Design a protein around this ligand. Structure first.
Ligand SMILES: [K+]
Ligand SMILES: [Mg+2]
Ligand SMILES: [Mg+2]
Ligand SMILES: [Mg+2]
Ligand SMILES: [Mg+2]
Length: 191
RNA sequence: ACAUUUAACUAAAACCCCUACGCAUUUAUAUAGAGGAGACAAGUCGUAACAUGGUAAGUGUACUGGAAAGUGCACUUGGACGAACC
């Protein structure tokens, strides 16, 4: 998270690949020599590209610093590209009551609808002996509620020496969805 | 609605009416189904309250929510502010 604003008269790095206001390449110069050009022409330096290993800074007028981001306010509006996926966690118990399993199963439907990743963990119930035969039958019971909407990303594993099982769910991908749709129509309509 | 008759040298005889009660009305019971409260006391999801209970608590009202509840507006102390200046 950054902004196209002036860095000020405090430069962290001694050597900077300075750039002219008109786009001319001044070339690498000492940090002290950079401030001389900020006063000589009353201009502000903005870091154009952090990624490059050599420091890159371009000095431009205040109006030039407004027009730049004023276009970054439209590019994201016109073509927003927000793809981060939040990860959610749930820790259930083998002996979880059905009512609590229907309330937590409806919470997963809101997460899958918002394209989140649901990490589900199941633990041995309090003073209850149970294997992984019926302890792994809750995932299939939760996924069934979401037939097309959700599908496994990861699969049940013995995270902690078999006492607990962890799985990850995701929203069905567009392509996958179409495949599911296509299959559903043939079973009933063709018959 | 209904009618004064016979009799009368001692005096008597004669008499006999029609309409109500209902698909009205009152109260209670039985039954399909639905939903409270209590007792008992498991399990499950949380941790709302009691300490400034970890966002002080609560009243009224409104909206909201798996659930205790949360928020807004006004009100209360059945809260506190540490009690010379510095
Ligand atoms: K409270
Ligand atoms: Mg509490
Ligand atoms: Mg509290
Ligand atoms: Mg209140
Ligand atoms: Mg709210």
């Amino acid at each position: 998270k950054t902004a196209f604003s002036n860095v000020g008269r405090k430069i962290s790095q001694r050597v900077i690949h300075l750039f002219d206001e008109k786009g001319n390449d001044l070339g690498n110069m000492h940090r002290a020599n950079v401030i001389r050009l900020m006063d000589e022409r009353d201009l502000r330096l903005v870091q154009r590209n952090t990624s490059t290993e050599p420091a890159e800074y371009q000095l431009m007028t205040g109006l030039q610093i407004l027009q730049e981001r004023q276009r970054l306010r439209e590019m994201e509006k016109a073509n927003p590209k927000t793809g981060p996926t939040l990860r959610k966690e749930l820790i259930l118990s083998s002996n979880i009551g059905q009512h609590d399993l229907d309330t937590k199963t409806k919470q997963i439907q809101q997460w899958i609808k918002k394209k989140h990743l649901v990490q589900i963990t199941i633990k041995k119930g309090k003073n209850v002996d149970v294997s992984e035969n019926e302890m792994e039958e809750i995932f299939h019971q939760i996924l069934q509620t979401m037939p097309g909407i959700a599908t496994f990303s990861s699969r049940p594993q013995a995270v902690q020496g078999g006492k607990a099982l962890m799985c990850v769910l995701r929203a069905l991908s567009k392509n996958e969805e179409k495949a599911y749709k296509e299959t559903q129509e043939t079973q009933e309509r063709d018959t």
